[PDB]
Design an enzyme around this catalytic site. Structure first.
Site, PDB file in Angstrom:
ATOM      1  CB  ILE A 205     -13.119 -13.087 -24.100  1.00 42.35           C
ATOM      2  CG1 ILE A 205     -14.032 -13.872 -25.048  1.00 42.35           C
ATOM      3  CG2 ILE A 205     -13.024 -11.624 -24.573  1.00 42.35           C
ATOM      4  CD1 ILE A 205     -15.395 -13.175 -25.257  1.00 42.35           C
TER       5      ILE A 205
ATOM      6  NE  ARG B  27      -5.946 -21.007  -1.027  1.00 46.09           N
ATOM      7  CZ  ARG B  27      -6.299 -20.879  -2.301  1.00 46.09           C
ATOM      8  NH1 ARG B  27      -5.609 -21.495  -3.254  1.00 46.09           N
ATOM      9  NH2 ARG B  27      -7.343 -20.131  -2.622  1.00 46.09           N
TER      10      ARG B  27
ATOM     11  CB  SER C 248      -9.891 -22.573  -3.298  1.00 44.13           C
ATOM     12  OG  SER C 248     -10.788 -23.280  -4.142  1.00 44.13           O
TER      13      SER C 248
ATOM     14  N   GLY D 200     -13.821 -21.918  -6.829  1.00 46.64           N
ATOM     15  CA  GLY D 200     -14.156 -21.430  -8.151  1.00 46.64           C
ATOM     16  C   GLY D 200     -14.137 -22.536  -9.199  1.00 46.64           C
ATOM     17  CG  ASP D 201     -10.985 -23.916 -10.890  1.00 45.50           C
ATOM     18  OD1 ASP D 201     -10.475 -24.154  -9.773  1.00 45.50           O
ATOM     19  OD2 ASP D 201     -10.327 -23.425 -11.823  1.00 45.50           O
TER      20      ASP D 201
ATOM     21  CE  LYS E 164      -7.012   5.325  -7.349  1.00 47.44           C
ATOM     22  NZ  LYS E 164      -5.921   6.278  -7.694  1.00 47.44           N
TER      23      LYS E 164
ATOM     24  CB  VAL F 272      -0.958   0.038   1.229  1.00 52.56           C
ATOM     25  CG1 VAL F 272      -1.772   1.325   1.253  1.00 52.56           C
ATOM     26  CG2 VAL F 272      -1.875  -1.188   1.255  1.00 52.56           C
TER      27      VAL F 272
ATOM     28  CG  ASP G 163      -7.717 -25.702 -14.676  1.00 53.98           C
ATOM     29  OD1 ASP G 163      -8.004 -25.711 -15.879  1.00 53.98           O
ATOM     30  OD2 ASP G 163      -7.892 -24.715 -13.948  1.00 53.98           O
TER      31      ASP G 163
ATOM     32  CB  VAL H  37     -16.485 -14.847 -22.209  1.00 56.34           C
ATOM     33  CG1 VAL H  37     -16.589 -16.156 -22.958  1.00 56.34           C
ATOM     34  CG2 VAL H  37     -17.819 -14.109 -22.240  1.00 56.34           C
TER      35      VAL H  37
HETATM   36 MG   LIG Z   1      -9.050 -23.451  -8.492  1.00 56.99          MG
HETATM   37 NA    NA Z   2      -8.200 -24.014 -11.877  1.00 55.47          NA
HETATM   38 NA    NA Z   3     -11.872 -14.028 -19.848  1.00 56.26          NA
HETATM   39 NA    NA Z   4       3.185   0.503   2.747  1.00 53.92          NA
END
Ligand SMILES: [Mg+2]
Ligand code: NA
Ligand code: NA
Ligand code: NA
Ligand SMILES: [Cl-]
Ligand SMILES: [Cl-]
EC number: 2.7.7.7
Length: 326
Positions: free
Chosen positions: A97, A174, A171, A180-181, A63, A56, A247, A94
DNA sequence: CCGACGGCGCATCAGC
DNA sequence: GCTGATGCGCC
DNA sequence: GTCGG
């Protein structure tokens, strides 16, 4: 999530820099700051307090002061109102993309889901599948489903050859309640850093998972990395489960620990850890940890018999997977 | 000030 | 065909 | 955008 407002702001800024500005270092800077703030165990009172954290700086501190004062960021308010930026940001959602293709599509007047659907002919294979499952791919995976997916993959791999070892990383390893997948690291004794004594080791596994209708589509596929789509089976009269990204990475068996360290992540953790390795005179990839010679050239692979051996080399105390969610 | 910022697999394309 | 660059993806 | 020297 004591500082969710700030970390969301920084993530949005990061995404803008990646997708619209095409400024990858600014993208990495914002995510690094979001991550360090995410784990800070106090509700942040000011930019100056934030600036004490590594990652930071002055600009983010400013900000943060605006965001605390008003609850928003004018810079983002304007970005959100910008049609071109908004369009480009949408299209990059997507799979397949990226920032370049998104900007090219918008140039051609392709800028909505409807546009993409009617212009499938303009999409490569990966993009075609990303579009097909656009909605599904933005849904998270409950750990309960991840466990069912794990059972299928490990059992089907076993049926191909009892010597395969499949490890679900990402994940999931962990300890995340949602993923997510699905990331699967695969080893087999026939594939080491010294030799490949069997061809098609990854192929045979993918083939089997397709045969049982678990893998449903392929985004890309080579000798060592599969990137695709899978789906849990559903019961009679049950609505179908969403399609999920999967994957699979085949790593030389004698390089399992570097492999599982890599594939466990998180991505920011890996960046942080690898950057620290450099500072310590080492370079780490998914295969090896090697010293840097004086010239600044990578030397020979160091002996590694555990994930912890890798942390030891760079003088970090060991961190369990559940503590690498940066 | 200013260079470095993690590392690499697969798909695609330019140039030969 | 090849090699090298680039895009996009993974953690 | 931030850091390290
Ligand atoms: Mg993953
Ligand atoms: Na993955
Ligand atoms: Na993408
Ligand atoms: Na800093
Ligand atoms: Cl940049
Ligand atoms: Cl290597």
């Amino acid at each position: 999530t004591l500082n969710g407002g700030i970390t969301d702001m920084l993530t949005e800024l990061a995404n803008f820099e990646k997708n619209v500005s095409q400024a990858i270092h600014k993208y990495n800077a914002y995510r690094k700051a979001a991550s360090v703030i995410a784990k800070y165990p106090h509700k942040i009172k000011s930019g100056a307090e934030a600036k004490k954290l590594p990652g930071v700086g002055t600009k983010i501190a400013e900000k943060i002061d605006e965001f605390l004062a008003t609850g928003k960021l004018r810079k983002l308010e304007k970005i959100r109102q910008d049609d071109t930026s908004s369009s480009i940001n949408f299209l990059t959602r997507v799979s397949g993309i990226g920032p370049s293709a998104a900007r090219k599509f918008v140039d051609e007047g392709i800028k909505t889901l409807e546009d993409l659907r009617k212009n499938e002919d303009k999409l490569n294979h990966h993009q075609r599948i990303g579009l097909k499952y656009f909605g599904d791919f933005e849904k998270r995976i409950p750990r309960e489903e991840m466990l069912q997916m794990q059972d299928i993959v490990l059992n089907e791999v076993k049926k191909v050859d009892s010597e395969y070892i499949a490890t679900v990383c990402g994940s999931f390893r962990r300890g995340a309640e949602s993923s997510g997948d699905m990331d699967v690291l695969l080893t087999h004794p026939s594939f080491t850093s010294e030799s490949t004594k069997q061809p098609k080791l990854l192929h045979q596994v993918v083939e089997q998972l397709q045969k049982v209708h678990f893998i449903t589509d392929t985004l890309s596929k080579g000798e060592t990395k599969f990137m695709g789509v899978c789906q849990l089976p559903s019961k009679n009269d049950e609505k179908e489960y969403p399609h999920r990204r999967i994957d699979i990475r085949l790593i030389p068996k004698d390089q399992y620990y570097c492999g599982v360290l890599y594939f466990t992540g998180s991505d920011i953790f890996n960046k942080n850890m690898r950057a620290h390795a450099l500072e310590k005179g080492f370079t780490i990839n998914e295969y090896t940890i090697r010293p840097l010679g004086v010239t600044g050239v990578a030397g020979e692979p160091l002996p590694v018999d555990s994930e912890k051996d890798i942390f030891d080399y760079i003088q970090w105390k060991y961190r369990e997977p559940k503590d690498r969610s940066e």
